[PDB]
Amino acid sequence: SHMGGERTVTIRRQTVGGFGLSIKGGAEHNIPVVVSKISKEQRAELSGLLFIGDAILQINGINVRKCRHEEVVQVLRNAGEEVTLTVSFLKRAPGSAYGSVKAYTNFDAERDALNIETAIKTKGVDEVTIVNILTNRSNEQRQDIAFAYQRRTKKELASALKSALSGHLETVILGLLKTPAQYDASELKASMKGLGTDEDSLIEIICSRTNQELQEINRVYKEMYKTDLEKDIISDTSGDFRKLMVALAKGRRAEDGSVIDYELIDQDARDLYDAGVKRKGTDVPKWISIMTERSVPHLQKVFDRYKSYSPYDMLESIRKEVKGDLENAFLNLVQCIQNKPLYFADRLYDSMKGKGTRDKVLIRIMVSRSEVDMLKIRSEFKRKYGKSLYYYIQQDTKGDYQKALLYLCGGDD
């Protein structure tokens, strides 16, 4: 969200019966009211003065920044012939530059839904067409495709593809159709389903997701399953492992500070040492407090400074000090803090190196990181393992399932 420099613009009522403007937004959507369309008439008058994407900050000196939609339309409707706007351009925040899946430029949700309907109803199901489309669309575009498909067929898209697709391909495609928060929410529910817990999957998602992502996950989890994510974590975890997971899942880690606190970096490094290697036993609450509350750039420097006081680095210290699920959680969290692309590169390698494939981890990472940092993951993977992630997917998977994953990868390295 980039707000441009403020500007004043005068608009005049037209004899057609209005200002020739269209607006969206408002305080209810927690984004300011923005100009969405300028008429043919008004554009000739306002060439270079007002633009689509301009947020309306003031109307005739009245601040409408924190006003909801109808409040703004009532002011402009109950206004005079001329109106003076204070405006500012809203350049929407860009996505990641390091994702493999980009948004298709000439995107037609109706044409995509039609082509998918044709592929689904082709005798034998045209999987290639389905994979080609959905792996070359952004997640948001797939949501538009799903809405258009349901109107066209009276059938939900994910429901249709669950019967048209089978095996691991179905798992990939159904995974791509969910929003990021829905996918993680449903993967978390799956890790806590029935008796026992897939702690590895719970650890992977909770340790790796950011504050904003965990915020949306906690909301979407409660909407889907009518229970709080924290309550299911409490019922499926125990001891200090539970406390760490509950702390992380809140998504209230300190945001990246502007200044580097070298004194706190040193004190956190010593407290981490004093709580573990330097003593008998471990002060696990101290470890949890520092590693869940401090910002990520800070902890990165804390872990390096820690090596000045400790004979072992943070990861080796964790292995020596704690065991079981608690150890595994700490090990994943520190990797995610130190180098998250490398973390995922190693988990991808682990899921393919040996007999068969841990498809659950492979599919989840290729889906969830395709629009985040897949290009960095690929870079770290080729750097460490000498062959591309593309290569390993080829040797471990086959068929349309393989082609789907290769598309989410994005190419060879």
Partner: peptide
């Protein structure tokens, strides 16, 4: 994007 759009 594609939010409620009042035209004035």
């Amino acid at each position: 994007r594609k939010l409620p759009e009042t035209t004035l």
